[PDB]
């Protein structure tokens, strides 16, 4: 469920 670290964090 956790997104990739480089995904959109906003």
């Amino acid at each position, epitope marked *: 469920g956790n997104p990739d670290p*480089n995904a959109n*964090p*906003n």
Partner: antibody, heavy 125, light 107 residues
Framework: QVQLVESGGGVVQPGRSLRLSCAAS????????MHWVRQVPGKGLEWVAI????????YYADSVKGRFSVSRDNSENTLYLQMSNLRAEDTAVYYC??????????????????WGQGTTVTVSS | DIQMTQSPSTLSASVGDRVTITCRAS??????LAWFQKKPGKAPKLLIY???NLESGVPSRFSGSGSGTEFTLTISSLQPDDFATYYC????????FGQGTKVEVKR
């Protein structure tokens, strides 16, 4: 318009703790991911941690994992970095950095845009 | 991780020269590459994003190009305030910086 001001830096003995803070203004803090990045003397710049806009996701560099913790309070527009078990290798200028904000959500992966002025942490006996 | 190497590490140029800095990645990162300016005692400044898209606040004399593993930063007409250290940063897999390139004045 984006303004970031870090505080908390100073001298800490090896093995002790220290908390850094970062005050944000000029943008909607609760809608932006935030980074911690440091500039180590001798080395270069080094990513430390990222935190999602709502704090639901946190990722850490392997060199600080288990020792550092990143948090935020969107009601106070403040980013925190709790540092524990500090060693002399953590001496650096610590920068609060906003993740790149793209109103159009064009691209698949995200970097950083606005850096703070930085606060200096000196871990030494 | 992904390793970022810049060339040259240092360069001497005059006011008005065209300067090109190259940055190579140990793996393919498409266009997930940014360029930062930095001066001693000052915060870094984002110059180029997505390898070639100039930030709106940055003067048009700064230009970026490249995809995959080879990337270049260009300053068409070096102005007095352009002498600084420049860093490339990949943001494909976590975030790693190049070793920085110092632009010195030639006299």
């Amino acid at each position: 318009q984006v303004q970031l001001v870090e505080s908390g830096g100073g001298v800490v003995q090896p093995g002790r703790s220290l908390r850094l803070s970062c005050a944000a203004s000029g943008f909607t803090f609760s809608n932006s991911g935030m980074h911690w990045v440091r500039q180590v003397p001798g080395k270069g710049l080094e990513w430390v941690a990222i935190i999602w806009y709502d704090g639901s996701n946190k990722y850490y560099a392997d060199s600080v994992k288990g020792r550092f913790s990143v948090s935020r309070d969107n009601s106070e527009n403040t980013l925190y970095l709790q540092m524990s078990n500090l060693r002399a290798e953590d001496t650096a200028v610590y920068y609060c950095v906003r993740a790149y904000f793209d109103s159009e959500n064009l691209y698949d992966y995200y970097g950083m845009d606005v850096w703070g002025q930085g606060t200096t942490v000196t871990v030494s006996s | 991780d992904i390793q970022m190497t810049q060339s040259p590490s240092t360069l001497s140029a005059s006011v008005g020269d065209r300067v090109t800095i190259t940055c190579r990645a140990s793996q393919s990162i498409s266009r997930w590459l940014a360029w930062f300016q930095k001066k001693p005692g000052k915060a870094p400044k984002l110059l180029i994003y997505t390898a070639s898209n100039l930030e709106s606040g940055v003067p048009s004399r700064f230009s970026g190009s490249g995809s995959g593993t080879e990337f270049t930063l260009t300053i068409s007409s070096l102005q007095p305030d352009d002498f600084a250290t420049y860093y490339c940063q990949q943001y494909y897999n976590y975030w790693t910086f190049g070793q920085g390139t110092k632009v010195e004045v030639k006299r």
